[PDB]
Amino acid sequence: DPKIVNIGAVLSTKKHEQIFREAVNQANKRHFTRKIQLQATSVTHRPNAIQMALSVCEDLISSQVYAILVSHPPALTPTPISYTAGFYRIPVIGLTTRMSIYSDKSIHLSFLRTVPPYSHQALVWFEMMRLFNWNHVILIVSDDHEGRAAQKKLETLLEGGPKADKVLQFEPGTKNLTALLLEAKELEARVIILSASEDDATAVYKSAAMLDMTGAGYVWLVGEREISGSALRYAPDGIIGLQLINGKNESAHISDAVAVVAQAIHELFEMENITDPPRGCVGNTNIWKTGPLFKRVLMSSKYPDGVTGRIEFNEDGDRKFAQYSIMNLQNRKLVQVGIFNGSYIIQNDRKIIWPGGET
Amino acid sequence: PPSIGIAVILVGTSDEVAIKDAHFHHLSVVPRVELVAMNETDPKSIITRICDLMSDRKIQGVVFADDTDQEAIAQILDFISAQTLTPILGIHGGSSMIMADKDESSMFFQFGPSIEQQASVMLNIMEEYDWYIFSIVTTYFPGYQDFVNKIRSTIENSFVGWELEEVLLLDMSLDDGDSKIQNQLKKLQSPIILLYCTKEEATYIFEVANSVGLTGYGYTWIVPSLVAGDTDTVPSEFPTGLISVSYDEWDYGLPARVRDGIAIITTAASDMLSEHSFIPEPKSSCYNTHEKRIYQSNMLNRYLINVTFEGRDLSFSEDGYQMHPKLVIILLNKERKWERVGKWKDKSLQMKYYVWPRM
Numbered sequence: 001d002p003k004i005v006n007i008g009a010v011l012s013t014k015k016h017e018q019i020f021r022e023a024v025n026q027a028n029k030r031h032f033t034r035k036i037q038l039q040a041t042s043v044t045h046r047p048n049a050i051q052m053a054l055s056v057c058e059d060l061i062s063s064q065v066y067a068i069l070v071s072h073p074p075a076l077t078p079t080p081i082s083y084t085a086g087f088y089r090i091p092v093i094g095l096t097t098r099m100s101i102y103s104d105k106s107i108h109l110s111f112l113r114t115v116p117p118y119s120h121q122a123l124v125w126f127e128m129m130r131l132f133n134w135n136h137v138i139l140i141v142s143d144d145h146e147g148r149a150a151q152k153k154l155e156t157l158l159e160g161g162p163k164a165d166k167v168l169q170f171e172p173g174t175k176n177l178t179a180l181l182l183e184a185k186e187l188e189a190r191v192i193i194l195s196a197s198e199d200d201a202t203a204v205y206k207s208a209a210m211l212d213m214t215g216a217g218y219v220w221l222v223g224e225r226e227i228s229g230s231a232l233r234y235a236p237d238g239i240i241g242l243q244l245i246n247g248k249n250e251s252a253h254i255s256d257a258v259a260v261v262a263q264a265i266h267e268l269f270e271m272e273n274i275t276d277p278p279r280g281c282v283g284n285t286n287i288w289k290t291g292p293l294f295k296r297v298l299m300s301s302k303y304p305d306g307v308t309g310r311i312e313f314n315e316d317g318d319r320k321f322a323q324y325s326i327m328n329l330q331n332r333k334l335v336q337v338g339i340f341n342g343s344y345i346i347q348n349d350r351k352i353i354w355p356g357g358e359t
Numbered sequence: 360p361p362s363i364g365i366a367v368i369l370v371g372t373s374d375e376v377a378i379k380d381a382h383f384h385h386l387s388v389v390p391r392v393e394l395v396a397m398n399e400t401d402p403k404s405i406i407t408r409i410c411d412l413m414s415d416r417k418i419q420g421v422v423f424a425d426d427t428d429q430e431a432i433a434q435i436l437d438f439i440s441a442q443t444l445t446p447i448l449g450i451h452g453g454s455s456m457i458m459a460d461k462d463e464s465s466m467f468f469q470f471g472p473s474i475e476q477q478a479s480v481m482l483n484i485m486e487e488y489d490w491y492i493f494s495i496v497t498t499y500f501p502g503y504q505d506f507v508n509k510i511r512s513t514i515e516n517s518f519v520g521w522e523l524e525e526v527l528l529l530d531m532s533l534d535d536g537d538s539k540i541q542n543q544l545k546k547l548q549s550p551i552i553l554l555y556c557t558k559e560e561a562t563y564i565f566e567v568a569n570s571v572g573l574t575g576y577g578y579t580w581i582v583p584s585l586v587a588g589d590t591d592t593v594p595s596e597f598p599t600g601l602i603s604v605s606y607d608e609w610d611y612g613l614p615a616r617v618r619d620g621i622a623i624i625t626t627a628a629s630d631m632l633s634e635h636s637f638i639p640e641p642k643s644s645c646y647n648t649h650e651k652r653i654y655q656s657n658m659l660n661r662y663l664i665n666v667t668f669e670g671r672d673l674s675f676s677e678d679g680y681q682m683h684p685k686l687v688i689i690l691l692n693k694e695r696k697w698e699r700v701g702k703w704k705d706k707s708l709q710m711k712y713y714v715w716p717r718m
């Protein structure tokens with residue numbers, strides 16, 4: 001009876017493929033599916049980018065997928081899949097990729113994600129600046145795409161209140177940073193915000209401790225990369241950072257993505273003159289004419305009751321209403337001292353300890 | 360002298376005998392060229408064809424030409440070049456249509472002008488005819504920022520009384536069912552309009568602009584090479600009076616281009632082997648680039664960009680475009696034919712008309 005509509009996925013393991021199947025299978029039970037009925041098509045990540053592009057063509061687009069779920073490879077990026085699917089204007093839904101570069105519409109012209117880019121951590125910092133009445137901050141960021149992205153996002157929030165007394169950029173890979181950090185020390189503001197990779201945050205932390213800038217008086221406010229791996233290992237006690245709740249749970253995001261995509265398909269097919277996507281890549285060089293419409297329907301999708309909370313997307317197709325743990329390094333243990341619940345800061349009953357010993 | 364393999368890939372093109380005849384080499388190395396004919400220009404056809412070549416023979420380099428308007432072909436080739444670390448020259452067609460922000464590891468070089476060079480020619484044209492008030496329309500097609508930036512920075516450092524009235528940014532990754540592109544174009548007042556987008560994007564945008572009365576007399580639209588594209592294919596939406604900068608097979612024929620492509624790659628490899636007593640080993644496979652990447656590099660780039668052949672400077676920029684190409688200014692006249700109306704040469708403009716004839 002029903003028209004079969006294939007959804008595609010590139011996922012980390014075969015376990016995650018089966019979770020994708022069952023998620024689609026449950027969408028079919030939930031929904032009214034006399035007219036259209038979803039079907040799951042999936043592979044796991046190929047060992048390199050060229051194989052991965054070929055697989056998207058051979059295994060997914062040959063099944064005429066309306067959309068493709070992509071997880072970030074756990075140990076190679078979503079990029080080849082964004083490229084090849086973007087060639088046809090088939091939407092790609094990123095499940096766990098956080099890099100801000102996937103927000104650039106020129107490079108990734110049909111890419112949504114159910115997690116926020118790292119640069120959106122600026123939204124949480126800003127609420128924390130209101131709450132804790134830090135009205136003068138210094139912003140140190142890596143002079144790469146990610147660091148600059150964080151800067152722009154925080155500045156948009158500040159410019160249009162709390163103010164940024166100064167912004168300092170440094171060359172990614174630089175080990176001694178005392179020149180940069182001596183410029184920050186001479187300023188009157190004592191709240192420092194950092195965007196940087198694991199390794200670059202390590203370098204910062206070491207230089208700052210050498211300059212006695214990690215002690216009482218100072219506040220350090222930081223994201224998730226900057227309290228991971230080796231950064232965590234040299235981080236100064238009392239530092240505040242963030243962790244995206246369910247941010248690495250591929251299984252949760254498969255569930256939510258499939259719910260959102262199923263909703264959007266059934267909504268798409270309420271409209272007139274929906275065309276099928278191209279069957280296979282070979283000999284096909286035109287875009288899927290309905291692809292840009294389907295993108296719009298996804299962009300404006302709302303799914304309140306998501307496993308990762310309230311799903312909506314912003315004008316770049318990035319997750320809104322994402323939830324963060326607010327973490328505080330006490331006695332060298334990361335402790336949760338509250339959450340950002342998507343719109344609101346909620347302090348829990350565990351006390352924050354600031355750099356030095358402050359209370 | 361030892362032979363290096365060079366693939367010449369021709370899509371849709373039969374000057375095959377004229378081409379083998381235009382192609383002599385006195386250097387440390389001699390080319391073994393292999394003409395290959397392709398029919399399809401989707402991602403799978405292009406990737407597998409080039410990867411088959413690399414696996415069946417020993418390819419030091421690829422010279423690529425097509426007869427399409429498909430700018431994606433350049434994107435695909437940059438990706439293939441970056442991943443396999445193999446020199447690819449896109450000398451004609453979609454393959455030559457500007458690819459802005461090539462990969463860091465790209466060895467992909469294009470015949471034709473940079474974006475910035477075209478922007479600069481467009482302002483010279485406007486100066487010639489004292490058109491000083493203008494607006495800009497772009498899509499999100501990559502390059503759009505370089506375009507706007509180059510304009511803005513040229514005119515803001517100029518005693519000339521430029522007036523940039525409006526800059527529109529059109530999002531054609533979404534459907535246009537709410538007539539948003541109409542609404543945005545309605546805002547345009549300027550008598551000169553610079554348009555940066557793809558040929559297919561331009562034909563929709565012109566269709567809409569016509570409907571709101573912006574294509575007739577007292578509006579003059581100016582566009583870059585990739586919008587005119589193949590000047591024997593003229594969408595009916597293109598308005599008479601359209602001016603374009605062009606590097607589409609005018610005075611620089613495909614036969615000559617293939618010859619120069621072969622020379623650039625052959626010379627580069629000769630120069631390297633002279634200075635270093637090796638050249639890079641032709642990749643045996645693109646299906647294991649992940650293993651063999653610590654053994655590869657884009658060393659050959661620094662030679663690829665500094666070649667002169669038969670007493671001619673064929674330099675590329677590091678950014679992967681021809682250094683000083685002779686550009687042809689063209690006009691879409693009352694007969695819907697593209698007509699030569701200028702040359703840009705030795706960095707001087709020479710126009711045919713002192714006053715524009717009727718459209």
Ligand SMILES: *[C@@H]1O[C@H](CO)[C@@H](O[C@@H]2O[C@H](CO)[C@@H](O[C@@H]3O[C@H](CO[C@H]4O[C@H](CO)[C@@H](O)[C@H](O)[C@@H]4O)[C@@H](O)[C@H](O[C@H]4O[C@H](CO)[C@@H](O)[C@H](O)[C@@H]4O)[C@@H]3O)[C@H](O)[C@H]2NC(C)=O)[C@H](O)[C@H]1NC(C)=O
Nearest residue numbers: 304308309310311321322323339340341342343344345346
């Ligand atoms: C993150 O956390 C925030 C803040 O806690 C949540 O936002 C709140 O959501 C709750 C619902 O769970 C809302 O509570 C309702 O408030 C209504 C009035 O709101 C006005 O007044 C408040 C307080 O000044 C303002 O914050 C708000 O902007 C409005 O001006 C009440 O009318 C509701 O009462 C209803 O339910 C009760 C309980 O059953 C009944 O007794 C009543 O009869 C009535 O039916 C209710 O109390 C609250 O308004 C929200 N606040 C804000 C600031 O948005 C987010 O939901 C949460 N995010 C996630 C994803 O969990």
Ligand SMILES: CCCCN(CCc1ccc(Cl)c(Cl)c1)C[C@H](O)COc1ccc(NS(C)(=O)=O)cc1
Nearest residue numbers: 083084087107402434435438498499500530531532
């Ligand atoms: C650094 C920039 C890389 C660009 N990347 C390459 C696309 C690509 C690369 C490789 C392959 Cl295999 C394929 Cl199939 C496709 C994406 C591609 O260029 C996107 O192309 C468009 C981007 C934007 C637009 N304009 S728009 C957003 O509709 O209004 C039109 C086309």
Ligand SMILES: *[C@@H]1O[C@H](CO)[C@@H](O)[C@H](O)[C@H]1NC(C)=O
Nearest residue numbers: 246249250251252253255307
């Ligand atoms: C991941 O999410 C799923 C729900 O989809 C849940 O069952 C599981 O406990 C989560 N895993 C972690 C580590 O929280």
Ligand SMILES: *[C@@H]1O[C@H](CO)[C@@H](O)[C@H](O)[C@H]1NC(C)=O
Nearest residue numbers: 371395396397398399404408
């Ligand atoms: C391309 O088309 C030509 C002309 O028909 C044909 O001879 C050739 O076999 C085709 N190539 C492929 C790969 O099919």
Ligand SMILES: *[C@@H]1O[C@H](CO)[C@@H](O)[C@H](O)[C@H]1NC(C)=O
Nearest residue numbers: 630661662664665666667674
């Ligand atoms: C490029 O042109 C010639 C060598 O071909 C020489 O004058 C110049 O130094 C070259 N530049 C290099 C090698 O970077």
Ligand SMILES: [Cl-]
Nearest residue numbers: 057280281282
């Ligand atoms: Cl295929």
Ligand SMILES: [Cl-]
Nearest residue numbers: 337347348350
């Ligand atoms: Cl707390």
Ligand SMILES: [Cl-]
Nearest residue numbers: 397398399404
């Ligand atoms: Cl073919």
Ligand SMILES: [Cl-]
Nearest residue numbers: 437438441462
């Ligand atoms: Cl690439």
Ligand SMILES: [Cl-]
Nearest residue numbers: 456457584585
């Ligand atoms: Cl171009």
Ligand SMILES: [Cl-]
Nearest residue numbers: 428557558559
């Ligand atoms: Cl086009």
Ligand code: NA
Nearest residue numbers: 111112316317
């Ligand atoms: Na996006």
